[PDB]
Write a protein that binds this ligand. Structure first.
Ligand code: ATP
Ligand code: ATP
Ligand code: MG
Ligand code: MG
Lengths: 241, 241
């Protein structure tokens, strides 16, 4: 349902090759984890899904549609991206979550906040969902902001959801709620998670290991650990050393 | 050399109490980990060490100097903070690292970059340290940007170095490099590390567990892990399973 075929990418005609002959099929309903060293090409890979950039070689396809000849506006709607950092607008928490669709009532707002694990702390603020967030973003803490951003992205409701280190600063309990809810979140859609914390993607249907712009290893968490000399094993065994 | 006595803090006279009756002493040269749930008061604690805000009861002292009497110019040179997200200026890597002390010898810049684990990727670039970074912050990757920021802070050379989730989006190898270099990073200084990944603060001299604006637990990695009912043990058990 999402296909990378013979993808070769570099940023400038002078730039070194960033993505080197990548081939990948991601079928609808799959949770895909993407791991690898800092600078290996994880983010660049997700940018071709959005067509901020075009490859010099190969094709990107969604549902059999070549993105190179697809409608620009159509593609924008299909992809929702949650980054590491998120600025919230100087308005209420409910308004911030409902950005993509007001008129959508309090219940689907709360459900989105319950999925993101935000409803608890919002209920215990005095002003509640009517709490006006900062003129810069953070009248709240980093993780609270980030959970509001996740709740908003769920309301946005794209058919392709990209988490780019979205949870890596959240505490284990907070991330667990979101990863526990991943079964409801990815119903009828594709979820792509780029993680530095390997434990985040432990239950992905497929984990992709990037190195120097190549998909170097692949499989489930336990399948990747079967080879002790694998790159995935080396990073995993660095958890506490 | 860092003391909190009977600290009560809130952000506004309207705001609820964030930090309550906190007492903390951190001697010179130590490496301190701070852990806790999102919204527990970790960032707030470090904000008072810079006097962005002032308490209603209690005192903050650095090297025996009450911050109510401190020179604001002095304190900024004393406390250097690396956050989760960092902006680079649209100029060369060496100009970005050198910002605080330009004209400083090139091998001191390179040394700081080696401690951050940035030297290897910078050298592999076509233009090396002379590479003009993002027309935004980064024509680099997030983790590359982050390691440049860490190097920049080491060059600032503060007596107190605060990492607020600075490594949480770094891969296990890049973070391991920084933590192995920690024994050189904290030569003649104190280092405070806020992390969601509890493995990051494993070898810290002391670990501080925050919960709802209070220091609930305090000790060494395994001393805290030994407690059958402690929050630290509960949070660690959420990592492995
Ligand atoms: N705008 C850009 N122009 C030129 N090169 C870039 C640009 N953005 C990234 N790169 C380069 O492409 C390579 C991969 O970058 P990418 O952001 O995809 O890596 P990443 O795996 O997401 O890194 P991290 O894990 O640190 O976020 C790196 O060598 C990086 O320097
Ligand atoms: N600028 C601010 N104004 C008012 N309240 C704030 C501000 N920053 C944080 N708070 C509130 O103070 C409490 C503690 O915030 P703090 O940022 O210290 O938590 P934290 O432990 O750093 O969380 P995280 O791990 O998510 O960053 C939270 O309940 C938050 O809503
Ligand atoms: Mg990236
Ligand atoms: Mg914080």
């Amino acid at each position: 349902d999402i296909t990378f075929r013979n993808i070769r990418f570099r940023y400038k005609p002078d730039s070194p090759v960033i993505l080197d002959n990548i081939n990948l099929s991601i079928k609808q309903g799959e949770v895909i984890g993407i791991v690898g060293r800092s600078g290996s090409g994880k983010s660049t890979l997700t940018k071709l899904i959005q067509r901020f950039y075009i490859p010099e070689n190969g094709q990107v396809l969604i549902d059999g549609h070549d993105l190179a000849l697809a409608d620009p506006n159509w593609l924008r709607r299909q992809v929702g991206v949650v980054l590491q950092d998120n600025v919230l607008l100087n308005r209420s928490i409910i308004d911030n979550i409902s950005l993509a669709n007001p008129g959508m009532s309090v219940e689907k707002v709360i459900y989105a906040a319950k999925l993101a694990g935000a409803h608890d702390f919002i209920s215990e603020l005095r002003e509640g969902y009517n709490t006006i967030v900062g003129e810069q973003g953070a009248g709240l803490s980093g993780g609270q902001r980030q959970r509001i951003a996740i709740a908003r992205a769920l309301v946005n409701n794209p058919k392709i959801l990209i988490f780019d280190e979205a949870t890596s600063a959240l505490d284990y309990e907070s991330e667990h709620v979101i990863m526990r809810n991943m079964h409801k979140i990815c119903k009828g859609r594709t979820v792509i998670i780029i993680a530095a914390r390997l434990s985040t993607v432990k239950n992905a249907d497929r984990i992709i290991v990037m190195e120097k712009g190549k998909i170097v290893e692949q499989g489930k968490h336990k399948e990747l650990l079967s080879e002790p000399e694998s790159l995935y094993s080396y990073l995993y065994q660095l958890q506490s050393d």
